[PDB]
Amino acid sequence: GSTLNRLREPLLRRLSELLDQAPEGRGWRRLAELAGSRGRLRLSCLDLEQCSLKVLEPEGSPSLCLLKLMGEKGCTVTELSDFLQAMEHTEVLQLLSP
C-alpha cells in the first residue's frame, strides 16, 4: 500500500489545495479529527498545530502538512478516500440530527 507522502508532488499539491478550499465542515481539521479517532492514526491537537501554522507562510498549506503527516503515519490513498466519504456522510447526519 502506497502512502500519501509518496504520491507524486503535483498530485499531493492539487489534493492539498482542494482540501484547503473545503468548507470547515469538511476541511483539513475535520479530516484530522476523524482520522485521529482511529487507533491506527493518532493525531493530537499538538500534531495538528504544526500544520495549522503553515498558513503563516505566504502560500503555506495546512492540508499538505496534514496529508504528508497522515502518510508518514501509514495512510494510503484509498484510506484517505474512505475518510473523506465518511466526512461527507457524517456531515449530512450531523445536519439532520436534532
Task: Write structural notes for this entry.
- The termini are far apart.
- It is built from five helices and no strands.
- The chain has helices at 9-21, 28-37, 45-52, 62-72, 77-96.
- The chain has one domain (3-98): Death Domain, Fas, CATH 1.10.533.10.
- Helix 1 packs across helix 4 (62-72) and helix 2 (28-37) packs across helix 5 (77-96).
- It is classed as hydrolase.
Question: Key terms for this structure?
Answer:
Death Domain, Fas; globular; Mucosa-associated lymphoid tissue lymphoma translocation protein 1; hydrolase; Death domain; malt1; monomeric; 98 residues; mainly alpha
- Helix count equals 5
Helix content: 55-70%
Beta-strand content: under 5%
Oligomer: monomer
User: Over the alpha carbons, how many angstroms does the gyration radius reach?
Assistant: 13 Å
Total domain count = 1
Name the CATH homologous superfamily.
Answer: Death Domain, Fas
Structural class category: mainly alpha
SSE pattern, N- to C-terminal: HHHHH
- Biggest sheet record: none
CATH topology: Death Domain, Fas
Task: Report the CATH architecture.
Answer: Orthogonal Bundle
Please tally the β strands and state the result.
0
Report how far the terminal alpha carbons are from each other. Answer: 40 Å
Shape: globular
